Amino acid sequence: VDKIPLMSPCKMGKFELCHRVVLAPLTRQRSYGYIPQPHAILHYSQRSTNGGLLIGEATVISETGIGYKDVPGIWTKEQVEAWKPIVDAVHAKGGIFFCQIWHVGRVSNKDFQPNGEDPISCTDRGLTPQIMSNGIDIAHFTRPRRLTTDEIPQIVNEFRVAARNAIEAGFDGVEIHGAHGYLIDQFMKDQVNDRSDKYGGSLENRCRFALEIVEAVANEIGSDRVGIRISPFAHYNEAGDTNPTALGLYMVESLNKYDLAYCHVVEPRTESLVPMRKAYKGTFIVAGGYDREDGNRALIEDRADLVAYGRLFISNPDLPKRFELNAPLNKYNRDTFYTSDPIVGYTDYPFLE
């Protein structure tokens, strides 16, 4: 077997990764009652390799951050203890595990909120209905409540606690969810942020929330245990920006001072991550539409240090091994991406024979 770029070792902060194939954060909606479950142990265990990086599924930081059924949270002792066995199985195979901490902001409904309250956001504009994963049901969203200037720090604090909880759970680090139109991205994107205070207006102001969050977390658990994900070019959840590249450049530049473990950036649908990679001084992770070929290339062309795989890692437990041996890949069934069975479409994808 000839060595390939995707299999090359890599130093990422305090971690010695053995290869560059990363498991991207994947929401599977199989965490009943917002509590991590036993089947997650097998799932993440099936995907752990020695020195391989795994980014866990988006994990809700607080009650108000829920916008989906059965997603895991990390604000209660019950949730923390539930994560431990999952974290242990991953470590048992020598993998590095980061918990993605998340808050949906306006992407929610009052039925998901405590005491039927409205979701919180940088704006009071809500989302139009969207078709769910099955293609039969419609997702309706409640208009959000625009957070006041002095409430925001309270939210910044929620990410902090959560980050702390993740470490108590055993996680090696946390990835801040600054993408896909959720709370943090809502503040960054100008098509959404219509604030008149310091958290809105200019590009510097719109990124303040994010940067305050990065600082709160880095300070709490050490910047070497912190990663952040952004999607400057995505319009997911009606959250675009009239100047993606500047937003992206402003962000990476701004993050250099925090000496993070990495910056995870999502590819577009021109628009390029290259300028961002060039402006960012630390470990750069790219994700979105990659295969084995595109992965080795991006690494060889200096476009990234690590490559995250979503859909392919869903249907291929041994993705790294298959890339290392250039073996065929299992097809993935999107119909069971978000379904709720503990096995079907979650842990029944076969390893190489």
Interface ranges with ligand FMN (CB under 6 A): 24-27, 57-58, 100, 177, 179-180, 229, 266, 287-290, 309-312, 337-338
Q: Is 310 among the annotated ligand-binding positions?
A: yes
CB neighbours (10 Å) of residue 53?
Answer: 28
Compute the least distance from the CB of residue 98 to ligand FMN, in Å.
11
Q: Is 20 among the annotated ligand-binding positions?
A: no
Instruction: Output 83 or 337, the one with its CB closest to ligand FMN.
Output: 337
Q: Give 281's contacts (C-beta < 8 A, 6+ positions apart).
A: 256
- Amino acid letter, 311: R
3-state secondary structure of 248: helix
Instruction: Output 205 or 330, the one with its CB closest to ligand FMN.
Output: 330
User: What are φ and ψ of residue 163, in 5° steps?
Assistant: -60, -40
Instruction: Output 92 or 344, the one with its CB closest to ligand FMN.
Output: 344
- Amino acid letter, 194: D
Q: Is 31 among the annotated ligand-binding positions?
A: no
Q: Is 105 among the annotated ligand-binding positions?
A: no
- Please tell me what DSSP assigns to residue 288: S
Compute the least distance from the CB of residue 313 to ligand FMN, in Å.
7
Chain-centre distance for alpha carbon 298: 20
Strands 59-60 and 96-102 come out as: parallel
Instruction: Output 118 or 226, the one with its CB closest to ligand FMN.
Output: 226
Q: Are 172 and 15 in contact (CB under 8 A)?
A: yes
Q: Is 289 among the annotated ligand-binding positions?
A: yes
349: annotated active-site residue: no
Residue 157 vs residues 218, 325, 345: alpha-carbon distances, Å:
12, 45, 36
Instruction: Output 323 or 337, the one with its CB closest to ligand FMN.
Output: 337
Q: Is 180 among the annotated ligand-binding positions?
A: yes
Compute the least distance from the CB of residue 289 to ligand FMN, in Å.
5
- Amino acid letter, 225: R
Q: Catalytic residue among 34, 44, 68, 182, which? A: 182
Q: Which two tokens stand for residue 248?
A: 């992206």
Distance CA 284, CA 308 (A): 10
Q: Which two tokens stand for residue 184?
A: 């943090």
Compute the least distance from the CB of residue 247 to ligand FMN, in Å.
17
Compute the least distance from the CB of residue 240 to ligand FMN, in Å.
17
Report, as residue numbers or ranges, the catalytic residues: 182
Residues annotated as binding site for FMN? 25-27, 58, 100, 229, 289, 310-311
Residues annotated as binding site for substrate? 133, 177-180, 269
Residues annotated as binding site? 25-27, 58, 100, 133, 177-180, 229, 269, 289, 310-311
